[PDB]
Scaffold this active site. Structure first.
Site, PDB file in Angstrom:
ATOM      1  N   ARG A   1       0.890  -1.165   0.000  1.00 53.89           N
ATOM      2  CA  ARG A   1       0.000   0.000   0.000  1.00 53.89           C
ATOM      3  C   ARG A   1       0.936   1.225   0.000  1.00 53.89           C
ATOM      4  O   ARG A   1       1.727   1.391   0.935  1.00 53.89           O
ATOM      5  CB  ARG A   1      -0.862  -0.004   1.282  1.00 53.89           C
ATOM      6  CG  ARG A   1      -1.571   1.315   1.475  1.00 53.89           C
ATOM      7  CD  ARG A   1      -2.933   1.200   2.118  1.00 53.89           C
ATOM      8  NE  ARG A   1      -3.547   2.530   2.153  1.00 53.89           N
ATOM      9  CZ  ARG A   1      -3.338   3.421   3.121  1.00 53.89           C
ATOM     10  NH1 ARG A   1      -2.602   3.106   4.174  1.00 53.89           N
ATOM     11  NH2 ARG A   1      -3.902   4.615   3.063  1.00 53.89           N
TER      12      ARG A   1
ATOM     13  N   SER B   1       0.188   7.824   0.970  1.00 52.74           N
ATOM     14  CA  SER B   1       0.578   9.132   0.445  1.00 52.74           C
ATOM     15  C   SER B   1       1.760   9.147  -0.531  1.00 52.74           C
ATOM     16  O   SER B   1       1.981  10.155  -1.191  1.00 52.74           O
ATOM     17  CB  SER B   1       0.774  10.144   1.567  1.00 52.74           C
ATOM     18  OG  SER B   1      -0.534  10.549   1.933  1.00 52.74           O
TER      19      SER B   1
ATOM     20  N   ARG C   1     -12.536  11.588   0.338  1.00 52.83           N
ATOM     21  CA  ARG C   1     -11.652  12.753   0.279  1.00 52.83           C
ATOM     22  C   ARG C   1     -12.258  13.987  -0.408  1.00 52.83           C
ATOM     23  O   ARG C   1     -11.807  15.102  -0.148  1.00 52.83           O
ATOM     24  CB  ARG C   1     -10.299  12.380  -0.356  1.00 52.83           C
ATOM     25  CG  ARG C   1      -9.541  11.273   0.392  1.00 52.83           C
ATOM     26  CD  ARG C   1      -9.311  11.597   1.869  1.00 52.83           C
ATOM     27  NE  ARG C   1      -8.688  10.458   2.558  1.00 52.83           N
ATOM     28  CZ  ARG C   1      -8.595  10.325   3.878  1.00 52.83           C
ATOM     29  NH1 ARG C   1      -9.073  11.266   4.683  1.00 52.83           N
ATOM     30  NH2 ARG C   1      -8.040   9.237   4.403  1.00 52.83           N
TER      31      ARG C   1
ATOM     32  N   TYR D   1      -1.878  20.530   4.814  1.00 46.63           N
ATOM     33  CA  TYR D   1      -1.832  19.195   4.206  1.00 46.63           C
ATOM     34  C   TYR D   1      -3.268  18.679   4.023  1.00 46.63           C
ATOM     35  O   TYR D   1      -4.067  18.697   4.952  1.00 46.63           O
ATOM     36  CB  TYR D   1      -0.997  18.256   5.085  1.00 46.63           C
ATOM     37  CG  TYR D   1      -0.753  16.900   4.459  1.00 46.63           C
ATOM     38  CD1 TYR D   1      -0.207  16.784   3.183  1.00 46.63           C
ATOM     39  CD2 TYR D   1      -1.073  15.728   5.141  1.00 46.63           C
ATOM     40  CE1 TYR D   1       0.012  15.524   2.597  1.00 46.63           C
ATOM     41  CE2 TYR D   1      -0.841  14.467   4.571  1.00 46.63           C
ATOM     42  CZ  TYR D   1      -0.303  14.374   3.301  1.00 46.63           C
ATOM     43  OH  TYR D   1      -0.074  13.123   2.739  1.00 46.63           O
TER      44      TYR D   1
ATOM     45  N   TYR E   1      -8.059  -1.009   3.377  1.00 44.09           N
ATOM     46  CA  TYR E   1      -7.543  -0.705   2.039  1.00 44.09           C
ATOM     47  C   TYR E   1      -7.135  -1.945   1.255  1.00 44.09           C
ATOM     48  O   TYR E   1      -7.113  -1.897   0.029  1.00 44.09           O
ATOM     49  CB  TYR E   1      -6.386   0.286   2.122  1.00 44.09           C
ATOM     50  CG  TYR E   1      -6.756   1.617   2.731  1.00 44.09           C
ATOM     51  CD1 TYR E   1      -7.529   2.535   2.030  1.00 44.09           C
ATOM     52  CD2 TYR E   1      -6.315   1.970   4.002  1.00 44.09           C
ATOM     53  CE1 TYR E   1      -7.869   3.771   2.585  1.00 44.09           C
ATOM     54  CE2 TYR E   1      -6.649   3.203   4.569  1.00 44.09           C
ATOM     55  CZ  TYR E   1      -7.431   4.097   3.857  1.00 44.09           C
ATOM     56  OH  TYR E   1      -7.756   5.315   4.405  1.00 44.09           O
TER      57      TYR E   1
ATOM     58  N   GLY F   1       2.025   6.843   4.647  1.00 41.10           N
ATOM     59  CA  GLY F   1       1.613   6.470   6.003  1.00 41.10           C
ATOM     60  C   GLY F   1       2.342   5.281   6.609  1.00 41.10           C
ATOM     61  O   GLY F   1       2.867   5.406   7.702  1.00 41.10           O
TER      62      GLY F   1
ATOM     63  N   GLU G   1       2.533   0.625  10.456  1.00 40.99           N
ATOM     64  CA  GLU G   1       1.829   1.807  10.961  1.00 40.99           C
ATOM     65  C   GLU G   1       1.968   1.877  12.489  1.00 40.99           C
ATOM     66  O   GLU G   1       2.209   0.861  13.132  1.00 40.99           O
ATOM     67  CB  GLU G   1       0.361   1.780  10.556  1.00 40.99           C
ATOM     68  CG  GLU G   1       0.217   2.199   9.112  1.00 40.99           C
ATOM     69  CD  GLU G   1      -1.161   2.106   8.509  1.00 40.99           C
ATOM     70  OE1 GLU G   1      -2.017   1.368   9.047  1.00 40.99           O
ATOM     71  OE2 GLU G   1      -1.371   2.746   7.459  1.00 40.99           O
TER      72      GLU G   1
ATOM     73  N   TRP H   1       2.543   6.006  11.065  1.00 42.56           N
ATOM     74  CA  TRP H   1       3.512   6.914  10.458  1.00 42.56           C
ATOM     75  C   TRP H   1       4.414   7.497  11.551  1.00 42.56           C
ATOM     76  O   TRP H   1       3.987   7.620  12.704  1.00 42.56           O
ATOM     77  CB  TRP H   1       2.705   8.064   9.782  1.00 42.56           C
ATOM     78  CG  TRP H   1       3.534   9.229   9.334  1.00 42.56           C
ATOM     79  CD1 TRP H   1       3.627  10.455   9.942  1.00 42.56           C
ATOM     80  CD2 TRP H   1       4.507   9.225   8.286  1.00 42.56           C
ATOM     81  NE1 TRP H   1       4.590  11.217   9.315  1.00 42.56           N
ATOM     82  CE2 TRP H   1       5.148  10.486   8.301  1.00 42.56           C
ATOM     83  CE3 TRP H   1       4.944   8.250   7.364  1.00 42.56           C
ATOM     84  CZ2 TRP H   1       6.177  10.817   7.408  1.00 42.56           C
ATOM     85  CZ3 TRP H   1       5.952   8.595   6.460  1.00 42.56           C
ATOM     86  CH2 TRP H   1       6.516   9.883   6.462  1.00 42.56           C
TER      87      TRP H   1
END
Length: 400
Positions: free
Chosen positions: A69, A72, A160, A175, A245, A353, A375, A377
Site C-alpha cells: 500500500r 501518500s 476525500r 496538508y 484498504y 503512512g 503503521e 507513520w
C-alpha cells in the site's frame, strides 16, 4: 595481500536492519538507491511482508516485487499525471479549476461553529488553481487532521472529496485532499478514469505491470501482497492489522492515497525523474517540480508549522528543524541536511503512512527509497533505520 593476486557504513547499516527484524522491532523492509548514471544500483530486502504465519508456520518474505500500500507516496504519481496534462495543453497550472472542478469550486469554507453547534459556512475567496492543489495551498485539509473537520464529522454533518475547505486558496500551507482533487482534474481533462490514465501514462512507459488503484482486480498481486503491521502503542509489539484498504478498492481512484505497487516499480518512477529521461515528463517539467513554489509568507508559515509539529512530521527522517519549501510533488530542502554527508539543498521528498520514504536529490545525483508496511507513520525505529540507510549510502557513493 599482493595487488592483483588471489567498519563499513553500508555493512553496519545492513546489520542494523537485520537485527531490527530478528529482535521483532520491524517485520521487514526494502531499501533502494539509484544514481543518475546507472552505476549505483543498490537493493536490499529484509524480513517478512507480514506478521501472519502461513500454513507451514513461516513468514513470507518482503521482496523488491512485493505489492504494498503506497498510501501518500501515491501523491507523487498523481502530481506527475497532472503535470503531463499541463504539458499536453489540457490544463494551465495558474488558471481557475472552475472549468474542470465546478464541484470543488462550489465548496464552502467551514469557519467554525456558532454557540449552539451549527456549522458556520462561508463562500471561498479567490480562485483555486491546479498549482494550489499540488502545493497543499488550496485551503483543503483532511478530516483526521483538522480540529474543525474533526468536529464537523463528529456532529454528523458528512471520502476525500466531501469535506468543506478550512481556508481560502493561497492563505496557508495545509496538508490535505488537494492531490485527490488534482487526480479528479486529470480524469475530467482526459475523459479517462485515473486507473486507465495511470496505466497508459505512468506504467506502460516504464514497463510497470504491478501498479494499480484496483488491487481486487489482481488476484496475482493479492496472493503475494504485504499485510499491514501495526506497532501497539501500549507495549511497542508488532501486530497484524487487517487494513480496510487491502479488502476493497472502492469506486473512486483517490489520487492522494490509493495506489498499490512494489518498491521496485516505485523506484522506476523515482529513477526516471532523477535521470530526466523524458519517459514520464519533459526534463524542463521535472525541473519545475523541484522549484520552491511558495512565496516567502507561505514558506515561513509552512516552516513554522512543521518545526512546531514533530508529532506530524511530514519530513520523516529529515532533521526536525530545517529550512524547507514545497515544490510540485513534495517537500524541498532549502539547505543541506548535514553538509556534504547526506541530502543536499534542492532534494525533494515525501512519504506514505506505512513509514514509506522517497527522496530525489538532483544535486547529489541520487534517489532513495525505503518501504515498510508498518503503521503508525513517524515510527522512531523506521525513522532511525531510514536515516542510517541514507547516510551509509551517501557515504559509500561519495567515497567512490
Amino acid at each position: 595481500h599482493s595487488s592483483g593476486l588471489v567498519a563499513d557504513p553500508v555493512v553496519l547499516m545492513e546489520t542494523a536492519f537485520r537485527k531490527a527484524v530478528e529482535s521483532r522491532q520491524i517485520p521487514g523492509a526494502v531499501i533502494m538507491a539509484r544514481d543518475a548514471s546507472g552505476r549505483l544500483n543498490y537493493t536490499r530486502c529484509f524480513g517478512a511482508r507480514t506478521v501472519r504465519r502461513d500454513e507451514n508456520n513461516q513468514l513470507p518474505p518482503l521482496q523488491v516485487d512485493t505489492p504494498c500500500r503506497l498510501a501518500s507516496a501515491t501523491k507523487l504519481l498523481t502530481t506527475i499525471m497532472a503535470l503531463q496534462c499541463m504539458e499536453r495543453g489540457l490544463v494551465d497550472l495558474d488558471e481557475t479549476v472552475d472549468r474542470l472542478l465546478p464541484d470543488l469550486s462550489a465548496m464552502p469554507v467551514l469557519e467554525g461553529f456558532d454557540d449552539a453547534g451549527n456549522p458556520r459556512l462561508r463562500e471561498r475567496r479567490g480562485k483555486i488553481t491546479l498549482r494550489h492543489l499540488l502545493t497543499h495551498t488550496s485551503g483543503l485539509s483532511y478530516v483526521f487532521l483538522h480540529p474543525l473537520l474533526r468536529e464537523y464529522v463528529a456532529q454528523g454533518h458528512l471520502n476525500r472529496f466531501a469535506p468543506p475547505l478550512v481556508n481560502d486558496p493561497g492563505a496557508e500551507w495545509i496538508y490535505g485532499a488537494g492531490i485527490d482533487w488534482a487526480g479528479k482534474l486529470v480524469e475530467r481533462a482526459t475523459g479517462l478514469d485515473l486507473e486507465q490514465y495511470l496505466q497508459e501514462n505512468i506504467c506502460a512507459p516504464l514497463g510497470i505491470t504491478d501498479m494499480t488503484f484496483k488491487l481486487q482486480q489482481r488476484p496475482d498481486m493479492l496472493a503475494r501482497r504485504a499485510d499491514m503491521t501495526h506497532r501497539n502503542s501500549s507495549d511497542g509489539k508488532l501486530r497484524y492489522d487487517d487494513s480496510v484498504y487491502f479488502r476493497a478498492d472502492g469506486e473512486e481512484c483517490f489520487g492522494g492515497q490509493g495506489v498499490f505497487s512494489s518498491p521496485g516499480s516505485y523506484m522506476k518512477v523515482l529513477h526516471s525523474l532523477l535521470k530526466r529521461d523524458g519517459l514520464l515528463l519533459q526534463p524542463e517539467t521535472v525541473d519545475l517540480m523541484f522549484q520552491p513554489a511558495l512565496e516567502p509568507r507561505l514558506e515561513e508559515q509552512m516552516n513554522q508549522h512543521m518545526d512546531a509539529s514533530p508529532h506530524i512530521n511530514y519530513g520523516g527522517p529529515m532533521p526536525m528543524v530545517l529550512r524547507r519549501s514545497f515544490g510540485l510533488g513534495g517537500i524541498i530542502a532549502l539547505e543541506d541536511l548535514d553538509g556534504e554527508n547526506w541530502r543536499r539543498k534542492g532534494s525533494m521528498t515525501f512519504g506514505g503512512g506505512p513509514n514509506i520514504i522517497w527522496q530525489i536529490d538532483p544535486k547529489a545525483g541520487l534517489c532513495t527509497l525505503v518501504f515498510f508496511q508498518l503503521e503508525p507513520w513517524n515510527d522512531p525505529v523506521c525513522r532511525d533505520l531510514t536515516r542510517t540507510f541514507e547516510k551509509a549510502i551517501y557515504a559509500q557513493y561519495q567515497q567512490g
